[model samples]
Target: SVKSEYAEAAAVGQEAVAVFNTMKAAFQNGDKEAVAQYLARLASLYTRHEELLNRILEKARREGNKEAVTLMNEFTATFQTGKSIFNAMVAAFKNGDDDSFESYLQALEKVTAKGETLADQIAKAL
Candidate 1:
């Protein structure tokens, strides 16, 4: 059950990757304003994604699904990497530190990697 839920989330995340790609392309094309707008939107989406997952975890806990409890805990931990990256990106934008952009992107990549791992684990459990 947790696996199916996370797999669903992973599908949503794939959509997010499309959005990120578009934003990246726009940024490389010299559209700073577009980049900023897209980044803000991406941040919002990520927030919502985490919120939904947390809710799911809470519900699972209430239902006494031990597997869900464990999986959710692991998933939440993995998600922190992405959340950290999101925060770093926002901070970089605030400080206008162009160099930090790559760091943020690197974080995003890390998140993607971890997300895949979690998704695979979920699939295996299912």
Candidate 2:
């Protein structure tokens, strides 16, 4: 039931990753403008991803699939960490702290990587 929804979520997730890579590169090259541009894009993409996830979670709950429900909850929790780190990155960027921003970006890459694996696990659970 959630296959289409998962596809949509994955689409946005990939977009965010692509944008993040560009953003990371821009930051490394000292292109603040490009970094700011991609940061906004990533935020919008993630917002859509979160929306799709909520719909999927509701569908799972309605189906009474406890395993899927549990997996989805964990997935949400894991994904939320990425979001938090992104927010931290934004704050660091605003403060003109490259070191902090770079560290947060590194952390975000790891969280998103873990999130991809968690998503696969959820798909299997489904």
Candidate 3:
């Protein structure tokens, strides 16, 4: 059931990779303006992604699907990583700390890794 719902919806999550890449490039190239631009876009995109995830989680709960409930629970970046990491990046940007950029990127990478794992599990569950 989790797989079915996830597949049907196509798991409308963040493609944070692109932003991460551009962010890394901007940071490395010493382009602070570019960094700010992409960070704004990242914020917009991630906001939408989080909204959709909540809807999906709601659907899963109403359907009484434990697998989805568990996977969705495991997929809990809402608190564990997402906000703080993004906040840290924004803070670093505000301070113009180029070095802290990598740390933020690393945090985003963990989110992507966790997402990949959930996606793989969803595929197998199908």
User: Residues 1-126, candidate 3, lDDT per residue (tens digit)?
Assistant: 545555544544535566768888888888888888988887877676666566667877888877766777777553347756887888888987767867777876776666666766544533
Off by over 4 Å in 2: none
Worst 10 residues of 3 by lDDT: 7-16
How does candidate 1 score on lDDT?
0.75
Query: Total clashing residue pairs per candidate?
Result: 0, 0, 0
Over 29-118, each residue of candidate 1 has an lDDT whose tens digit, in order, gives 878899888888888778777876887688778888777678778888878877887788778877878778766776787777776666
Count: clashes, candidate 3: 0
Give per-residue lDDT, candidate 3, residue 122: 44
Alpha-carbon error at 100 in model 2, in Å? 0.2
Which stretches of candidate 1 lie above 4 Å from their native place? 1-8, 123-126
TM-score of 1: 0.81
In model 2, the Cα lDDT at residue 44 comes to 90
| TM-score for predicted model 2 compared with the true structure | 0.95
Model 2, 50-111: lDDT tens per residue? 99999999999999989989989988998999999999999899999999998998899998
In candidate 3, stretches whose alpha carbon ends up further than 4 angstroms from where it belongs are 1-14, 78-80, 123-126
TM-score of 3: 0.80
